[PDB]
Write an enzyme that holds these catalytic residues in place. Structure first.
Site, PDB file in Angstrom:
ATOM      1  N   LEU A 298       0.841  -1.187   0.000  1.00 32.07           N
ATOM      2  CA  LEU A 298       0.000   0.000   0.000  1.00 32.07           C
ATOM      3  C   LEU A 298       0.884   1.248   0.000  1.00 32.07           C
ATOM      4  O   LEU A 298       0.541   2.247  -0.631  1.00 32.07           O
ATOM      5  CB  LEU A 298      -0.872  -0.017   1.262  1.00 32.07           C
ATOM      6  N   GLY A 299       1.989   1.172   0.738  1.00 35.43           N
ATOM      7  CA  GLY A 299       2.976   2.231   0.896  1.00 35.43           C
ATOM      8  C   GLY A 299       4.279   1.734   1.486  1.00 35.43           C
ATOM      9  O   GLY A 299       4.353   0.596   1.971  1.00 35.43           O
ATOM     10  N   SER A 300       5.334   2.576   1.410  1.00 35.31           N
ATOM     11  CA  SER A 300       6.660   2.267   1.945  1.00 35.31           C
ATOM     12  C   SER A 300       7.107   3.343   2.939  1.00 35.31           C
ATOM     13  O   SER A 300       6.328   3.758   3.802  1.00 35.31           O
ATOM     14  CB  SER A 300       7.677   2.126   0.817  1.00 35.31           C
TER      15      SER A 300
ATOM     16  N   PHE B 226       9.138   2.833   8.762  1.00 36.83           N
ATOM     17  CA  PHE B 226       9.977   1.763   9.316  1.00 36.83           C
ATOM     18  C   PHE B 226      10.105   0.552   8.368  1.00 36.83           C
ATOM     19  O   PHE B 226      10.830  -0.410   8.659  1.00 36.83           O
ATOM     20  CB  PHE B 226       9.459   1.336  10.700  1.00 36.83           C
ATOM     21  N   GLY B 227       9.427   0.637   7.231  1.00 38.12           N
ATOM     22  CA  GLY B 227       9.419  -0.408   6.219  1.00 38.12           C
ATOM     23  C   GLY B 227       8.260  -0.233   5.266  1.00 38.12           C
ATOM     24  O   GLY B 227       8.247   0.718   4.482  1.00 38.12           O
TER      25      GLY B 227
ATOM     26  N   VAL C  74       3.699  -0.846   4.418  1.00 37.05           N
ATOM     27  CA  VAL C  74       2.312  -1.024   4.836  1.00 37.05           C
ATOM     28  C   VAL C  74       1.664  -1.880   3.778  1.00 37.05           C
ATOM     29  O   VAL C  74       1.739  -1.538   2.601  1.00 37.05           O
ATOM     30  CB  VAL C  74       1.548   0.322   5.058  1.00 37.05           C
TER      31      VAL C  74
ATOM     32  N   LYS D  34       1.745  -3.120   9.289  1.00 38.98           N
ATOM     33  CA  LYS D  34       3.002  -2.393   9.261  1.00 38.98           C
ATOM     34  C   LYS D  34       4.077  -3.472   9.380  1.00 38.98           C
ATOM     35  O   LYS D  34       4.103  -4.219  10.362  1.00 38.98           O
ATOM     36  CB  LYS D  34       3.091  -1.395  10.434  1.00 38.98           C
TER      37      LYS D  34
ATOM     38  N   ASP E  74       3.361  12.984  16.849  1.00 40.76           N
ATOM     39  CA  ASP E  74       3.540  12.975  15.393  1.00 40.76           C
ATOM     40  C   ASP E  74       2.169  13.216  14.742  1.00 40.76           C
ATOM     41  O   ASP E  74       1.794  12.547  13.791  1.00 40.76           O
ATOM     42  CB  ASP E  74       4.163  11.635  14.939  1.00 40.76           C
TER      43      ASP E  74
END
Ligand SMILES: CNC(=O)c1nn(C)c2ccc(Nc3nccc(-n4cc(N[C@@H]5CCCNC5)c(C)n4)n3)cc12
EC number: 2.7.10.2
Length: 266
Positions: free
Chosen positions: A15-17, A18-19, A21, A38, A123
Protein backbone atom coordinates in the site's frame (compact mmCIF):
# COMPACT_ATOMS: atom_id res chain seq x y z
CA UNK A 1 -1.72 -9.80 21.42
CA UNK A 2 0.44 -12.39 19.53
CA UNK A 3 -1.34 -13.43 16.33
CA UNK A 4 -1.27 -16.75 14.45
CA UNK A 5 0.67 -16.24 11.10
CA UNK A 6 -1.31 -19.06 9.41
CA UNK A 7 -4.54 -17.00 10.05
CA UNK A 8 -2.86 -14.01 8.34
CA UNK A 9 -2.91 -13.63 4.53
CA UNK A 10 -0.81 -10.74 3.11
CA UNK A 11 -1.27 -9.10 -0.33
CA UNK A 12 1.86 -9.08 -2.60
CA UNK A 13 1.67 -5.39 -3.66
CA UNK A 14 2.31 -2.92 -0.85
CA UNK A 15 0.00 0.00 0.00
CA UNK A 16 2.98 2.23 0.90
CA UNK A 17 6.66 2.27 1.95
CA UNK A 18 9.98 1.76 9.32
CA UNK A 19 9.42 -0.41 6.22
CA UNK A 20 6.11 -1.08 4.45
CA UNK A 21 2.31 -1.02 4.84
CA UNK A 22 0.42 -3.94 3.22
CA UNK A 23 -3.19 -5.01 3.02
CA UNK A 24 -4.10 -8.38 4.45
CA UNK A 25 -6.79 -10.60 5.91
CA UNK A 26 -7.04 -12.08 9.38
CA UNK A 27 -9.29 -15.12 10.00
CA UNK A 28 -11.33 -14.09 13.08
CA UNK A 29 -13.62 -16.32 15.30
CA UNK A 30 -16.17 -16.36 12.38
CA UNK A 31 -15.78 -13.40 9.96
CA UNK A 32 -12.60 -12.63 7.96
CA UNK A 33 -11.19 -9.19 8.83
CA UNK A 34 -9.42 -6.89 6.31
CA UNK A 35 -6.27 -5.51 7.93
CA UNK A 36 -3.45 -2.98 7.31
CA UNK A 37 -0.10 -4.42 8.37
CA UNK A 38 3.00 -2.39 9.26
CA UNK A 39 6.01 -4.58 8.29
CA UNK A 40 9.46 -3.64 9.65
CA UNK A 41 12.37 -3.49 7.14
CA UNK A 42 13.22 -0.90 14.97
CA UNK A 43 11.87 -4.04 16.80
CA UNK A 44 11.66 -2.38 20.26
CA UNK A 45 10.06 0.70 18.61
CA UNK A 46 7.43 -1.50 16.95
CA UNK A 47 6.74 -3.36 20.26
CA UNK A 48 6.47 -0.01 22.14
CA UNK A 49 4.06 1.28 19.34
CA UNK A 50 1.93 -1.89 19.74
CA UNK A 51 1.94 -1.53 23.56
CA UNK A 52 0.54 2.05 23.21
CA UNK A 53 -2.19 0.95 20.69
CA UNK A 54 -3.26 -1.98 22.94
CA UNK A 55 -4.09 0.56 25.72
CA UNK A 56 -6.29 2.76 23.49
CA UNK A 57 -9.98 2.23 22.87
CA UNK A 58 -11.72 5.01 20.94
CA UNK A 59 -13.73 5.22 17.64
CA UNK A 60 -11.30 7.88 16.27
CA UNK A 61 -8.09 5.88 16.87
CA UNK A 62 -6.86 2.96 14.69
CA UNK A 63 -7.48 -0.38 16.50
CA UNK A 64 -4.57 -2.77 16.69
CA UNK A 65 -5.54 -6.45 16.09
CA UNK A 66 -2.16 -7.69 17.30
CA UNK A 67 1.45 -8.34 16.48
CA UNK A 68 3.06 -11.23 14.65
CA UNK A 69 6.73 -12.30 14.53
CA UNK A 70 7.40 -14.03 11.23
CA UNK A 71 9.66 -13.34 8.17
CA UNK A 72 9.75 -9.77 9.70
CA UNK A 73 8.00 -8.19 12.80
CA UNK A 74 4.41 -7.14 11.97
CA UNK A 75 1.86 -4.78 13.52
CA UNK A 76 -1.65 -5.78 12.34
CA UNK A 77 -4.37 -3.10 12.47
CA UNK A 78 -8.05 -2.70 11.48
CA UNK A 79 -8.03 -1.44 7.82
CA UNK A 80 -9.05 2.22 7.15
CA UNK A 81 -9.66 1.65 3.39
CA UNK A 82 -9.35 5.24 2.09
CA UNK A 83 -5.81 5.75 3.43
CA UNK A 84 -3.97 8.89 4.60
CA UNK A 85 -5.97 12.14 4.92
CA UNK A 86 -3.38 14.36 3.11
CA UNK A 87 -3.23 12.04 0.07
CA UNK A 88 -7.01 11.66 -0.02
CA UNK A 89 -7.56 15.44 0.04
CA UNK A 90 -4.83 15.98 -2.67
CA UNK A 91 -6.80 13.48 -4.86
CA UNK A 92 -10.30 14.75 -4.00
CA UNK A 93 -9.96 18.53 -4.21
CA UNK A 94 -13.77 19.06 -4.26
CA UNK A 95 -14.46 17.62 -0.70
CA UNK A 96 -16.72 20.30 0.87
CA UNK A 97 -15.68 22.61 3.67
CA UNK A 98 -18.41 21.08 5.97
CA UNK A 99 -16.84 17.63 5.32
CA UNK A 100 -13.31 18.92 6.27
CA UNK A 101 -14.72 20.34 9.54
CA UNK A 102 -16.43 16.99 10.23
CA UNK A 103 -13.11 15.10 9.78
CA UNK A 104 -10.89 17.50 11.80
CA UNK A 105 -13.58 17.48 14.53
CA UNK A 106 -13.28 13.61 14.64
CA UNK A 107 -9.52 13.96 14.98
CA UNK A 108 -10.10 16.40 17.90
CA UNK A 109 -12.39 13.81 19.60
CA UNK A 110 -9.69 11.09 19.33
CA UNK A 111 -7.14 13.62 20.68
CA UNK A 112 -9.48 14.69 23.57
CA UNK A 113 -9.51 10.93 24.42
CA UNK A 114 -5.67 10.61 24.13
CA UNK A 115 -5.23 13.71 26.39
CA UNK A 116 -7.72 12.26 28.96
CA UNK A 117 -5.70 8.93 28.76
CA UNK A 118 -2.42 10.91 29.39
CA UNK A 119 -0.72 9.77 26.16
CA UNK A 120 1.16 12.23 23.97
CA UNK A 121 1.03 11.40 20.23
CA UNK A 122 4.15 13.42 19.17
CA UNK A 123 3.54 12.97 15.39
CA UNK A 124 0.04 14.39 14.81
CA UNK A 125 -0.01 15.31 11.13
CA UNK A 126 -2.45 14.80 8.23
CA UNK A 127 -0.27 11.88 6.88
CA UNK A 128 -1.07 10.14 10.26
CA UNK A 129 -4.84 10.47 9.94
CA UNK A 130 -6.51 7.62 8.05
CA UNK A 131 -9.95 7.53 6.44
CA UNK A 132 -12.38 4.69 7.09
CA UNK A 133 -14.82 6.56 4.78
CA UNK A 134 -15.01 10.12 3.39
CA UNK A 135 -16.87 10.97 6.68
CA UNK A 136 -14.89 8.90 9.20
CA UNK A 137 -11.29 9.69 10.28
CA UNK A 138 -9.03 7.77 12.71
CA UNK A 139 -5.64 8.73 14.14
CA UNK A 140 -2.74 6.36 13.32
CA UNK A 141 1.08 6.15 13.65
CA UNK A 142 1.79 5.76 17.38
CA UNK A 143 5.55 5.09 16.79
CA UNK A 144 6.65 8.27 18.68
CA UNK A 145 3.82 8.14 21.27
CA UNK A 146 4.52 8.13 24.99
CA UNK A 147 2.52 7.25 28.09
CA UNK A 148 3.05 10.20 30.45
CA UNK A 149 4.48 9.51 33.89
CA UNK A 150 1.92 9.70 36.74
CA UNK A 151 3.80 12.72 38.16
CA UNK A 152 4.44 14.80 35.00
CA UNK A 153 2.32 16.42 32.31
CA UNK A 154 5.11 16.14 29.72
CA UNK A 155 7.63 13.73 28.15
CA UNK A 156 11.22 15.02 28.07
CA UNK A 157 13.10 13.81 24.99
CA UNK A 158 16.73 12.74 25.58
CA UNK A 159 18.58 13.78 22.33
CA UNK A 160 16.70 15.31 19.32
CA UNK A 161 14.54 12.64 13.01
CA UNK A 162 11.82 15.10 14.18
CA UNK A 163 8.87 16.47 12.09
CA UNK A 164 9.89 20.06 13.16
CA UNK A 165 7.17 21.80 11.04
CA UNK A 166 4.50 20.20 13.31
CA UNK A 167 6.33 20.83 16.59
CA UNK A 168 5.46 23.49 19.20
CA UNK A 169 8.23 25.98 20.24
CA UNK A 170 8.73 24.21 23.67
CA UNK A 171 9.43 20.90 21.81
CA UNK A 172 12.21 22.65 19.92
CA UNK A 173 13.50 24.81 22.82
CA UNK A 174 13.05 22.49 25.82
CA UNK A 175 12.40 18.97 24.27
CA UNK A 176 9.12 18.89 26.27
CA UNK A 177 6.14 17.07 24.67
CA UNK A 178 2.68 17.40 26.28
CA UNK A 179 -0.92 17.16 25.13
CA UNK A 180 -0.57 21.01 24.60
CA UNK A 181 2.27 20.39 22.12
CA UNK A 182 -0.09 17.83 20.37
CA UNK A 183 -2.64 20.79 20.22
CA UNK A 184 0.02 22.85 18.32
CA UNK A 185 0.53 19.92 15.88
CA UNK A 186 -3.32 19.67 15.56
CA UNK A 187 -3.31 23.38 14.43
CA UNK A 188 -0.83 22.43 11.64
CA UNK A 189 -2.98 19.34 10.82
CA UNK A 190 -6.09 21.68 10.51
CA UNK A 191 -4.07 23.97 8.15
CA UNK A 192 -3.09 20.86 6.05
CA UNK A 193 -6.72 19.62 5.89
CA UNK A 194 -8.22 23.04 4.91
CA UNK A 195 -5.30 23.30 2.36
CA UNK A 196 -6.39 19.94 0.81
CA UNK A 197 -3.24 18.08 1.94
CA UNK A 198 -0.64 20.72 0.98
CA UNK A 199 2.59 20.58 3.03
CA UNK A 200 2.87 23.31 5.72
CA UNK A 201 5.61 26.01 5.61
CA UNK A 202 6.24 25.32 1.91
CA UNK A 203 9.79 25.89 0.73
CA UNK A 204 11.13 26.65 4.25
CA UNK A 205 13.92 24.95 6.20
CA UNK A 206 13.18 23.86 9.82
CA UNK A 207 15.47 26.68 11.11
CA UNK A 208 13.48 29.18 8.97
CA UNK A 209 10.17 27.87 10.47
CA UNK A 210 11.63 28.36 13.97
CA UNK A 211 12.71 31.94 13.06
CA UNK A 212 9.23 32.67 11.58
CA UNK A 213 7.40 31.53 14.72
CA UNK A 214 9.79 33.32 17.08
CA UNK A 215 8.92 36.60 15.15
CA UNK A 216 5.24 35.81 15.98
CA UNK A 217 4.40 35.04 12.31
CA UNK A 218 1.93 32.22 11.40
CA UNK A 219 0.76 30.58 8.18
CA UNK A 220 -2.04 32.44 6.40
CA UNK A 221 -5.65 31.41 6.07
CA UNK A 222 -6.05 28.63 3.38
CA UNK A 223 -8.39 29.41 0.39
CA UNK A 224 -12.03 28.82 1.41
CA UNK A 225 -11.21 28.15 5.06
CA UNK A 226 -13.84 29.75 7.39
CA UNK A 227 -12.49 32.54 9.63
CA UNK A 228 -13.67 30.61 12.75
CA UNK A 229 -11.45 27.64 11.72
CA UNK A 230 -8.52 29.88 11.00
CA UNK A 231 -8.98 31.57 14.40
CA UNK A 232 -8.94 28.06 15.96
CA UNK A 233 -5.66 27.19 14.07
CA UNK A 234 -4.13 30.39 15.47
CA UNK A 235 -5.34 29.55 18.99
CA UNK A 236 -3.61 26.07 18.67
CA UNK A 237 -0.47 28.06 17.66
CA UNK A 238 -0.38 29.97 20.99
CA UNK A 239 3.35 30.29 21.79
CA UNK A 240 2.88 30.17 25.60
CA UNK A 241 2.20 26.50 26.57
CA UNK A 242 0.10 27.51 29.61
CA UNK A 243 -2.14 29.87 27.58
CA UNK A 244 -2.58 27.39 24.69
CA UNK A 245 -5.93 25.46 24.91
CA UNK A 246 -6.10 21.74 25.71
CA UNK A 247 -8.07 19.26 23.54
CA UNK A 248 -11.24 19.56 25.68
CA UNK A 249 -11.49 23.31 24.67
CA UNK A 250 -10.42 22.65 21.01
CA UNK A 251 -12.91 19.75 20.55
CA UNK A 252 -15.72 21.89 22.08
CA UNK A 253 -14.96 24.80 19.67
CA UNK A 254 -14.97 22.38 16.69
CA UNK A 255 -18.13 20.50 17.85
CA UNK A 256 -20.09 23.76 18.19
CA UNK A 257 -18.87 25.17 14.86
CA UNK A 258 -19.61 21.85 13.08
CA UNK A 259 -23.23 21.70 14.35
CA UNK A 260 -23.63 25.44 13.44
CA UNK A 261 -22.55 24.54 9.85
CA UNK A 262 -24.77 21.37 9.84
CA UNK A 263 -27.90 23.20 10.92
CA UNK A 264 -27.22 26.23 8.63
CA UNK A 265 -26.95 23.75 5.68
CA UNK A 266 -30.48 22.43 6.59
C1 LIG B 1 2.11 5.08 3.14
N1 LIG B 1 0.84 4.71 2.55
C2 LIG B 1 -0.20 4.31 3.28
O1 LIG B 1 -0.17 4.22 4.51
C3 LIG B 1 -1.44 3.94 2.53
N2 LIG B 1 -1.54 4.13 1.21
N3 LIG B 1 -2.81 3.72 0.87
C4 LIG B 1 -3.23 3.77 -0.52
C5 LIG B 1 -3.48 3.21 1.94
C6 LIG B 1 -4.75 2.67 2.05
C7 LIG B 1 -5.21 2.31 3.31
C8 LIG B 1 -4.38 2.42 4.43
N4 LIG B 1 -4.94 1.99 5.64
C9 LIG B 1 -4.46 1.83 6.91
N5 LIG B 1 -5.36 1.41 7.80
C10 LIG B 1 -4.91 1.26 9.06
C11 LIG B 1 -3.62 1.55 9.45
C12 LIG B 1 -2.79 2.04 8.43
N6 LIG B 1 -1.49 2.53 8.72
C13 LIG B 1 -0.66 3.22 7.90
C14 LIG B 1 0.42 3.58 8.68
N7 LIG B 1 1.53 4.26 8.37
C15 LIG B 1 1.54 5.00 7.10
C16 LIG B 1 2.96 5.46 6.73
C17 LIG B 1 3.43 6.62 7.61
C18 LIG B 1 2.44 7.78 7.55
N8 LIG B 1 1.08 7.30 7.99
C19 LIG B 1 0.59 6.20 7.16
C20 LIG B 1 0.17 3.02 9.96
C21 LIG B 1 1.01 3.04 11.20
N9 LIG B 1 -1.02 2.46 9.99
N10 LIG B 1 -3.20 2.25 7.17
C22 LIG B 1 -3.08 2.93 4.30
C23 LIG B 1 -2.64 3.35 3.05
Amino acid sequence: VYLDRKLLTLEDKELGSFGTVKKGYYQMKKVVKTVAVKILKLKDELLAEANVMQQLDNPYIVRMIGICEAESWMLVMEMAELGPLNKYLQQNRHVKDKNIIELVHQVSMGMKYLEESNFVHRDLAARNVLLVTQHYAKISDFGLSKALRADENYYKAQTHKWPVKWYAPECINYYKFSSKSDVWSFGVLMWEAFSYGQKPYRGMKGSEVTAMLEKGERMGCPAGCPREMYDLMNLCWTYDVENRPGFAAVELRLRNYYYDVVNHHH
